[PDB]
Amino acid sequence: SGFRKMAFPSGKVEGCMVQVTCGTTTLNGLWLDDVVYCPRHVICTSEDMLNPNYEDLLIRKSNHNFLVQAGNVQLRVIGHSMQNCVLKLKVDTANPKTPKYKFVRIQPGQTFSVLACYNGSPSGVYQCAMRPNFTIKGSFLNGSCGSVGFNIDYDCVSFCYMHHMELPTGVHAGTDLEGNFYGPFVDRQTAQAAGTDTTITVNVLAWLYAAVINGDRWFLNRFTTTLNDFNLVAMKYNYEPLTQDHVDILGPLSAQTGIAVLDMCASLKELLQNGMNGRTILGSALLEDEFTPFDVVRQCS
Amino acid sequence: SGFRKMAFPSGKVEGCMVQVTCGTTTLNGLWLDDVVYCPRHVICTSEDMLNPNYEDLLIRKSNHNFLVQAGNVQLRVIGHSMQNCVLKLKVDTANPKTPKYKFVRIQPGQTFSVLACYNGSPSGVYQCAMRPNFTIKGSFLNGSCGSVGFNIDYDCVSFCYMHHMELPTGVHAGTDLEGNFYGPFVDRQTAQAAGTDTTITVNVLAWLYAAVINGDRWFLNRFTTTLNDFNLVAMKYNYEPLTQDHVDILGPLSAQTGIAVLDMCASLKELLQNGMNGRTILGSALLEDEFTPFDVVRQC
Ligand SMILES: C[C@H](O)c1ccn[nH]1
Ligand SMILES: C[C@H](O)c1ccn[nH]1
Ligand code: NA
């Protein structure tokens, strides 16, 4: 029993982290086969960041301008190129600890593990969700750029995030491993802000099912509703609309507990309208929305 | 910015997890050098968990009764001994992935990362704290016995917990890596219940200092308190007594923010009295107590 915010074991990713330095700027890189991936803004000075021409900035750099440190060993850069907002540095040495991996792009509401690093050395791992406004509520300090997010499916690491910047509200923005940003952000020093965020409804329902499996039942009631009736409640309380695909995904938890999804949305409907009334759910006075249905099934079964 | 309950990178511990089987029982073991550590109740049968005589059960065991599996490879057991509540199986091969390590017995209020494991394969990693009643609020299913808790400091892994059992209230009990249980618990299936748990006061205060560091001051007030007056109030909310040691531990966080410890103690007194008024602190609607003073300085 028990329910915790749980991250994937980070060992397969720890063996891929390196330090990348170009001039004054030093950040983290991902070393896979004979290529090191890192944010392209490593090539930018403080003035370059205000309005950078990356293609022109990179055409003036050469291989020797990139110092790549894999622990205690230098890696010699033999090539450099850009894909979107990610810099690809071909190195002379293939990483012997390269795991089976893929580059995947996640959807808002899906979760992943983040390995926070500084100077190519991992310092911590935590779980987070891609918010509907395409930010993540991470914990990063200076030098965290190049930190990566990932999921593990059996033997294969699915890399889905690389950290690029922090927004003025304290949340964070990055790209997939092919350099495409999550959200309407650019890698330069301008006035950027996160849009208004919403709550991931399907994840809240999954978390309520996790509470029922763990013995928390006080919020269940005799009632049920329809998808249209509930989605009116969801929009009023700044929740994401619940779709029929969401109901299908929640199917296993509904069968395993005898609580239909619309049956459970009636509970959530009453929780949104009336509150929790002093009581807690899984040790929380907030409605948790950073557990996917898969997260609940994997941890609770 | 931001504040997450962050675990240590688990890689150095993943390379040490193995599968230990005896009879029909399978659980996890920790493979360091040429020794595999695992809970001694791996040798118990159905008829045994009420009043096991571990000495009598172990004397009937041979080395080849223990099957140790590291990944896909069988390790050959060449010896076995019992130290308190843990079994130590000597194996023919030293673990080539053995990190720098030591064994530490921790105090209530200390935090550590847990690598949850099943059949010697790691499942997930999360952060926990030793509660004042010597239990932990973990996430464990059948087959997780032998999972370990640890901290990492400058590539040295300090192992501080091994999981043994779940109590009827859904919380978990275990030993240090010398086999000594945390708290009054025993590896027996008789009636035993955790004492009434309390809130780790020194951790809440450190977490309040962390909220100030990240730019939030709404919960402060103009008052102070004596140490004894604070403890008279806090214990009425089932908070742990705050000692002069705890006041000393908070010195650095007080100096960085400019808020004396007893002034932050006054703010905590008011928070317990008022609640949060629909506000949050570092993203939570409750007072968090599983960040230590050491943890806050490390993350902030
Ligand atoms: C705090 C530091 O500037 C940073 C960079 C990206 N995230 N956080
Ligand atoms: C509940 C499950 O049987 C378990 C075993 C050890 N911890 N939790
Ligand atoms: Na209902």
Coordinates of C-alpha atoms in Angstrom, one line a residue, chain A residues 30-295:
Chain A
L30 CA 23.2 14.2 -23.5
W31 CA 25.8 11.7 -24.9
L32 CA 24.3 9.0 -27.0
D33 CA 26.3 6.9 -29.5
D34 CA 28.9 9.4 -30.8
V35 CA 26.7 12.6 -30.6
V36 CA 26.2 15.0 -27.7
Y37 CA 22.9 16.8 -27.6
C38 CA 22.5 20.2 -25.7
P39 CA 20.7 23.5 -26.1
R40 CA 21.9 25.6 -28.9
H41 CA 22.0 28.7 -26.7
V42 CA 25.3 27.4 -25.3
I43 CA 27.0 29.4 -28.1
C44 CA 25.5 32.7 -27.1
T45 CA 27.0 35.4 -24.9
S46 CA 24.9 37.7 -22.8
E47 CA 24.4 40.2 -25.6
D48 CA 23.9 37.4 -28.2
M49 CA 20.9 36.1 -26.1
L50 CA 19.0 39.4 -26.5
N51 CA 18.7 38.8 -30.3
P52 CA 20.7 35.8 -31.6
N53 CA 21.3 34.7 -35.2
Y54 CA 22.1 31.1 -34.4
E55 CA 23.0 30.1 -37.9
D56 CA 25.4 33.0 -38.2
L57 CA 26.7 32.5 -34.7
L58 CA 27.3 28.8 -35.3
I59 CA 28.9 29.4 -38.7
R60 CA 31.7 31.3 -36.9
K61 CA 32.2 28.6 -34.2
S62 CA 34.5 25.7 -35.0
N63 CA 34.9 22.2 -33.4
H64 CA 37.7 23.3 -31.1
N65 CA 35.3 25.8 -29.4
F66 CA 33.4 23.0 -27.7
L67 CA 34.8 21.4 -24.6
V68 CA 32.9 18.3 -23.7
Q69 CA 33.7 16.6 -20.4
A70 CA 32.5 13.1 -19.7
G71 CA 33.3 12.8 -16.0
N72 CA 37.1 12.9 -15.8
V73 CA 37.7 12.5 -19.5
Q74 CA 37.8 15.0 -22.4
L75 CA 35.8 14.2 -25.5
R76 CA 37.1 15.6 -28.8
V77 CA 34.5 17.2 -30.9
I78 CA 34.8 16.3 -34.6
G79 CA 31.6 17.9 -35.9
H80 CA 28.8 20.3 -35.1
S81 CA 25.3 21.0 -36.5
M82 CA 21.9 22.3 -35.5
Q83 CA 18.5 20.6 -35.5
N84 CA 15.9 23.3 -34.5
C85 CA 16.9 24.5 -31.0
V86 CA 19.2 21.6 -30.2
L87 CA 23.0 21.5 -31.0
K88 CA 24.4 18.2 -32.1
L89 CA 28.1 17.7 -31.4
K90 CA 29.6 14.7 -33.1
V91 CA 32.4 13.3 -30.8
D92 CA 35.2 10.9 -31.5
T93 CA 34.0 8.4 -28.9
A94 CA 30.8 6.4 -28.8
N95 CA 29.3 6.3 -25.3
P96 CA 29.7 2.7 -24.1
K97 CA 26.8 3.2 -21.7
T98 CA 24.4 4.1 -24.4
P99 CA 21.0 2.5 -23.5
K100 CA 18.3 1.4 -25.9
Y101 CA 16.5 4.7 -26.5
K102 CA 14.1 6.7 -28.7
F103 CA 13.2 10.3 -29.1
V104 CA 9.5 10.9 -28.4
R105 CA 7.4 14.0 -28.1
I106 CA 4.8 13.9 -25.2
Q107 CA 1.4 15.5 -25.0
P108 CA 0.2 17.9 -22.2
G109 CA -1.0 15.9 -19.3
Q110 CA 1.5 13.1 -19.7
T111 CA 4.2 12.7 -17.0
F112 CA 7.9 12.0 -17.1
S113 CA 11.0 11.9 -14.8
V114 CA 13.5 14.7 -14.8
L115 CA 17.2 14.1 -14.0
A116 CA 18.4 17.5 -12.8
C117 CA 22.1 18.0 -13.5
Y118 CA 24.8 20.6 -12.9
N119 CA 28.2 20.7 -14.8
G120 CA 27.3 17.3 -16.3
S121 CA 26.9 15.6 -12.9
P122 CA 23.4 14.5 -11.9
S123 CA 22.1 15.8 -8.6
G124 CA 18.5 14.7 -8.3
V125 CA 15.5 13.1 -9.9
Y126 CA 11.9 14.0 -9.7
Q127 CA 8.6 13.4 -11.4
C128 CA 6.6 16.0 -13.2
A129 CA 3.8 16.5 -15.8
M130 CA 3.7 18.6 -19.0
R131 CA 1.2 21.2 -18.1
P132 CA -1.6 22.2 -20.4
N133 CA 0.2 25.5 -21.0
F134 CA 3.3 23.5 -22.0
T135 CA 5.4 24.5 -19.0
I136 CA 6.6 22.2 -16.2
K137 CA 6.7 23.0 -12.5
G138 CA 10.3 21.8 -12.0
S139 CA 13.1 22.7 -9.6
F140 CA 16.1 24.2 -11.4
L141 CA 18.9 26.5 -10.5
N142 CA 21.6 28.2 -12.6
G143 CA 23.5 25.6 -14.7
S144 CA 20.5 23.2 -15.0
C145 CA 20.1 23.8 -18.8
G146 CA 20.5 20.6 -20.8
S147 CA 18.8 18.5 -18.0
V148 CA 16.6 15.8 -19.7
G149 CA 13.2 14.2 -19.0
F150 CA 12.4 10.6 -19.8
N151 CA 10.1 7.6 -19.4
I152 CA 11.2 4.0 -19.4
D153 CA 9.2 1.3 -21.2
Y154 CA 10.9 -2.0 -20.1
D155 CA 14.5 -1.8 -21.6
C156 CA 14.0 1.4 -23.7
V157 CA 14.5 4.9 -22.5
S158 CA 12.1 7.4 -24.2
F159 CA 13.7 10.8 -24.0
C160 CA 11.1 13.5 -24.2
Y161 CA 12.4 16.8 -22.7
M162 CA 15.5 18.9 -22.6
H163 CA 15.6 21.9 -20.2
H164 CA 16.2 25.3 -21.8
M165 CA 14.9 28.2 -19.7
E166 CA 13.0 29.4 -16.6
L167 CA 10.0 31.8 -17.0
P168 CA 9.4 34.8 -14.7
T169 CA 6.7 32.9 -12.7
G170 CA 9.2 30.3 -11.7
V171 CA 8.1 27.5 -14.0
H172 CA 10.2 26.1 -16.8
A173 CA 10.2 25.5 -20.6
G174 CA 12.2 23.2 -22.9
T175 CA 12.2 21.2 -26.1
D176 CA 11.9 17.7 -27.2
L177 CA 15.2 16.0 -28.2
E178 CA 14.7 17.0 -31.8
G179 CA 14.8 20.7 -30.7
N180 CA 11.1 21.6 -31.0
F181 CA 9.9 23.7 -28.1
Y182 CA 7.0 22.7 -26.0
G183 CA 4.7 25.7 -26.0
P184 CA 4.9 29.2 -27.6
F185 CA 8.5 29.9 -26.4
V186 CA 11.7 30.9 -28.1
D187 CA 15.3 30.5 -26.9
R188 CA 16.3 34.2 -26.4
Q189 CA 16.1 36.9 -23.8
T190 CA 12.7 38.6 -24.4
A191 CA 9.5 39.1 -22.5
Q192 CA 7.9 35.7 -22.3
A193 CA 5.2 34.5 -19.9
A194 CA 3.3 31.3 -19.3
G195 CA -0.3 31.3 -20.3
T196 CA -3.0 30.6 -17.8
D197 CA -2.8 27.0 -16.7
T198 CA -5.7 24.5 -16.3
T199 CA -6.1 21.3 -14.2
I200 CA -5.6 18.0 -15.9
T201 CA -9.0 16.4 -15.3
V202 CA -8.3 12.8 -16.4
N203 CA -5.3 12.8 -14.1
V204 CA -7.4 13.9 -11.1
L205 CA -9.9 11.1 -11.7
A206 CA -7.0 8.6 -11.9
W207 CA -5.7 10.0 -8.6
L208 CA -9.2 9.6 -7.0
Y209 CA -9.1 5.9 -8.2
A210 CA -5.7 5.6 -6.5
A211 CA -7.3 6.9 -3.3
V212 CA -10.1 4.3 -3.5
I213 CA -7.6 1.5 -4.0
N214 CA -5.8 2.7 -0.9
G215 CA -8.8 2.8 1.3
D216 CA -10.0 6.5 0.9
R217 CA -13.7 6.3 0.1
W218 CA -15.4 9.2 1.8
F219 CA -16.0 11.2 -1.4
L220 CA -17.9 8.4 -3.2
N221 CA -21.6 9.0 -3.4
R222 CA -24.7 7.3 -4.9
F223 CA -24.9 9.6 -7.9
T224 CA -23.7 9.6 -11.5
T225 CA -23.7 12.1 -14.3
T226 CA -23.1 12.5 -18.1
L227 CA -20.1 13.7 -20.0
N228 CA -21.9 16.9 -21.1
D229 CA -23.2 17.8 -17.6
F230 CA -19.7 17.3 -16.0
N231 CA -17.8 19.2 -18.7
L232 CA -19.9 22.3 -17.9
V233 CA -18.7 21.9 -14.3
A234 CA -15.1 21.4 -15.5
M235 CA -15.0 24.5 -17.6
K236 CA -16.3 26.6 -14.8
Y237 CA -13.6 25.4 -12.4
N238 CA -10.8 25.8 -15.0
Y239 CA -10.5 22.0 -15.6
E240 CA -9.6 20.5 -18.9
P241 CA -12.6 19.1 -20.8
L242 CA -13.1 15.4 -20.3
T243 CA -13.4 13.5 -23.6
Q244 CA -14.6 10.0 -24.5
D245 CA -11.0 8.9 -25.0
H246 CA -10.4 9.9 -21.4
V247 CA -13.2 7.7 -20.2
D248 CA -11.9 4.7 -22.2
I249 CA -8.4 5.2 -20.7
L250 CA -9.9 5.2 -17.2
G251 CA -11.7 1.9 -18.0
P252 CA -9.3 -0.5 -16.1
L253 CA -9.5 1.5 -12.9
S254 CA -13.3 1.7 -13.2
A255 CA -13.6 -2.1 -13.5
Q256 CA -11.0 -2.7 -10.8
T257 CA -13.0 -0.6 -8.3
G258 CA -16.6 -0.8 -9.4
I259 CA -16.8 3.0 -9.7
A260 CA -17.8 4.1 -13.2
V261 CA -16.0 7.1 -14.6
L262 CA -19.1 9.3 -14.7
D263 CA -19.9 7.8 -11.3
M264 CA -16.5 9.1 -10.2
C265 CA -16.9 12.4 -12.0
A266 CA -20.0 12.8 -9.8
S267 CA -17.7 12.6 -6.8
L268 CA -15.3 15.1 -8.4
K269 CA -18.3 17.3 -9.4
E270 CA -19.3 17.4 -5.7
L271 CA -15.7 18.0 -4.6
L272 CA -15.3 21.0 -7.0
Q273 CA -18.7 22.5 -5.9
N274 CA -18.5 21.8 -2.2
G275 CA -14.8 21.4 -1.3
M276 CA -13.2 18.8 0.9
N277 CA -14.7 20.0 4.2
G278 CA -11.5 19.6 6.4
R279 CA -10.9 16.1 5.1
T280 CA -7.9 15.0 3.0
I281 CA -7.3 12.5 0.1
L282 CA -4.1 10.5 0.1
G283 CA -2.6 13.0 2.5
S284 CA -3.5 16.1 0.4
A285 CA -5.8 19.0 0.8
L286 CA -5.4 19.7 -2.9
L287 CA -6.7 17.7 -5.9
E288 CA -3.6 16.1 -7.4
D289 CA -3.3 16.2 -11.2
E290 CA 0.2 15.0 -12.0
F291 CA -0.5 11.2 -12.0
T292 CA -1.7 9.7 -15.3
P293 CA -4.0 6.6 -15.4
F294 CA -0.9 4.6 -16.4
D295 CA 1.0 6.0 -13.4

